[PDB]
Ligand binder design. Structure first.
Ligand SMILES: [Zn+2]
Ligand SMILES: [Zn+2]
Ligand SMILES: [Zn+2]
Ligand SMILES: [Zn+2]
Lengths: 57, 56
């Protein structure tokens, strides 16, 4: 999607939530860290945030 | 923004090296690069890991 981060609605989607061989790119990196830090699941699949990847194009 | 290699499939292959990832290629072209021991196209750094990427 060409939309911004689902949480802050301002920063770009650059926080790949990675769980196994798939990642879910919906949030910015800082909002993705905030979810993981507060022990929140992946917004898309509600599966635990195994790791977060600062994504660039 | 199609895959830079096959110019057809979407960019869904996150080349991951450390905590940063470079999203320029599709997953199957990204596998092909890693398989053949080719570096990351963007930074020419080793492909540690490839991630099939999907949006919300
Ligand atoms: Zn955000
Ligand atoms: Zn997920
Ligand atoms: Zn491709
Ligand atoms: Zn790279």
């Amino acid at each position: 999607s060409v939309e911004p981060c689902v949480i802050c609605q301002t920063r770009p989607k650059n926080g790949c939530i990675v769980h196994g061989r798939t990642g879910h790119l919906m949030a910015c990196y800082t909002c993705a860290k905030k979810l993981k830090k507060r022990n929140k699941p992946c917004p898309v699949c509600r599966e635990p945030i195994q790791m977060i990847v600062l994504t660039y194009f």
